[PDB]
Subunit: 236 residues, 4 copies
């Protein structure tokens, strides 16, 4: 797997290079973020994350914020054209370990826009989910991810009473592959937004939610529970 | 059987199954026998453009086909697309040839679906645009004879090495991801589609046409859908 | 005189000028006397949402009004908007009070205009979204009593210091830039609009309503357009 | 005036800091670009320019390309939130001096998208012109700019026969002011595209076309003909 992700790291794993507080981070082929920023996760409130990148500027940026709480931002110079293949799948991942939290997605949108050296926009791909059904046929649900419960996407397993389980991992990839770079495109850009609700019975809720982009055939790596966020096969 | 709604660009008049006696555009609602047609000039060798548009409040599906070097034809039909279509569909382009033939080349195709809720937000939306097609076009499901050739184009029907089209061919391209055409909380559901195309033939009676269509998610080319059936329908009912 | 097309959210029944005997929504084509209405429940103190939608091929203007804590009303009318409207227009929100009153508060407003040509491209497009309004809202033309208050909202009609609405008020907000509603090369012309709003009143008979409207570029509040005339019309013809 | 512009500098003025070849440049309050790149202008062919920026990454980027010719790119790190006022007008400018060229705009689009710390997009402004009429009521035409001739925007004066005049300057601003930064926006982004046709009877056609963003009340500065591009009152 080839993975680029923006993580909402709610649990600090200092032994695998995480900062010692909850943080947001940009991950380029490693759980050890290339850049992080402190982030004050807020139990039981709706937050929003935004991701943005264009192929000329070559800087991947993210922002996470609470209306009535904290906010954080992070940016990293990388060219995704040398990282990511031409065809990718876009997705959301989340996990728990010993500690947990609901990893509840209320909404998710993604917008890829490819402008050509002509008048026309060569390619484009845009979706919005503000609600999720029990049979969400345009999402590939991996692991413990389920849709529909309360018109929501629950990436990690939640029991009937509404309490989260540990040792869970799950993801939701958009059904169609995304032509992230196409020939004849002069400018390739994308942005993403998701709104989420992290609830928990733990003092260090865990482990986080991530927006990712990967090879089309990406799947949950073996043992990627907990600190690995359902994203990486190891902590290198 | 498959459930089909489609706008047809019908190059060949099959009067014996209810086509008008000239090339036309039509709105097909579960039958190749159009509910509504309009006279249409297919300009051999020219790039044309079709636009489709509908909303769930108005319940009136409409299409326009134009050539930048010719004229325009339009057709509109009253129909409640949720009373025909299932909740989840796929969207596609189909085309066919029979005893008479033509290239059914797609230069570009876009589709925009928006469902609006009780609030400001969209419960749901999908939009794609294609302005070229490569060899391995991973976001399209190609059926029958369709290929994504290297002129950067999508060829729906079989074209030989020299570039001349073959008879008795059928091909389609479905967008990869299912489309959520109905959402229970959705108050206003709309979509529009556009495709540019080049129909070229050495024939003075080119056949058979191209169609934008919406179908059940598992739709596939019916057996015996060549020629006048446009790769859409298993018969002329 | 001004040329007006508007969807009205009419909170007060003026039976004596052809309103139904209940609150309603209506499509007004050059006259306050709606061509089509539907029964409508205005939920005092609640945020509602209106959606408007039309295209030039279908020629059927449609609207939906919903409360997330109530129900929905819809109205549709066949009308060719180029046979009513000039080439260039402005788009706006209007509201009024008369002897009876209500707050006519706008929380959000969007408008999307797209005109499609002979080719893949849009000859022309305009889209705006407002999800809040400041004190100096430079992309809106405010008329009469309208203010862009500091609750981040647009107040169309006069509200006193304590927050209770006044009678005998009229206000409007027009988007700054003219809209090119007709283009000669344009084959498909569509638009959709959405606004969220809060009508609040201490009255058990609140009045008068809010309207999304389209008008000549130089339109202004007609004299005597308070109350049942919704800031739109100079009389009840 | 406060001016941020991306220029398509077809004529080199080495005495005011231009490179010694035609170039594209990013201008931040000065005709002396903060960054330039060589650009092989191509007489009598349709080209396309793209501009892009977001307020998190804080990098303004541009690309100019010909289908059957040359292409160029330039990027500059700047925060436009400390440069540009909250309200702006967006526009196109072009000029001639002793030397000229048709400064013909075939199409122009702009897209401002403001995402909030909620689900919603706080504000947005998007327009597309692929054709231009003799009474283009949503453009403020300044100086010699005219619309309609051949469904086009001619920013600089062109005689009846179709040959360009020298000592001309003109611009077209979009009628509505643009709330480029609004409060409660978490991410502010914009992009712009214009396609153009530069034709000339000169070996060093002149002087260039620019996409700009300015204070709402911006107007052609006195003597901004020629090398100043209708943008700046002087060459500082
Ligand atoms: C003992 O730690 C476990 O739980 C934490 C937090 O849940 C994870 O980060 C880690 O990988 C383990 O699964
Ligand atoms: C003459 O009839 C045949 O050819 C026409 C035109 O190709 C088809 O429509 C039809 O199905 C038959 O195959
Ligand atoms: C009772 O009539 C008055 O009040 C109603 C409701 O406000 C208005 O519609 C009308 O124009 C008059 O001013
Ligand atoms: C003599 O130079 C003149 O013409 C060139 C190119 O047209 C301009 O750059 C310059 O400002 C002058 O107007
Ligand atoms: Ca961690
Ligand atoms: Ca036929
Ligand atoms: Ca009334
Ligand atoms: Ca110069
Ligand atoms: Mn981390
Ligand atoms: Mn037919
Ligand atoms: Mn009424
Ligand atoms: Mn320069």
């Amino acid at each position: 797997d080839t993975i680029v992700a923006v993580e909402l790291d709610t649990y600090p794993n200092t032994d695998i290079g995480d900062p010692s507080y909850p943080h947001i981070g940009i991950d380029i082929k490693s759980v050890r973020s290339k850049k992080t920023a402190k982030w004050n996760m807020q139990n039981g409130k709706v937050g929003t994350a935004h991701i943005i990148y264009n192929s000329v500027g070559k800087r991947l940026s993210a922002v996470v914020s609470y209306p009535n709480g904290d906010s954080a931002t992070v940016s990293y110079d990388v060219d995704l054209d040398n990282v990511l293949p031409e065809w990718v799948r876009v997705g959301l991942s989340a996990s728990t370990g010993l500690y947990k939290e609901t990893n509840t997605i209320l909404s998710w949108s993604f917008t890829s826009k490819l402008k050509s050296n002509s008048t026309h926009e060569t390619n484009a791909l845009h979706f919005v989910f503000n609600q999720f059904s029990k049979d969400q046929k345009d999402l590939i649900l991996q692991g413990d991810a389920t849709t529909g419960t309360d018109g929501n996407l629950e990436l990690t397993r939640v029991s009937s009473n509404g309490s989260p389980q540990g040792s869970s991992v799950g993801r939701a990839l958009f059904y169609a592959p995304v032509h992230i770079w196409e020939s004849s495109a002069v400018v390739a850009s994308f942005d993403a937004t998701f709104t989420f609700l992290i609830k928990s019975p733990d003092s260090h809720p865990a482990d986080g939610i991530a927006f990712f982009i990967s090879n089309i055939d990406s799947s949950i790596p073996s043992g990627s529970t907990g600190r690995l966020l359902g994203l990486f096969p190891d902590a290198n």
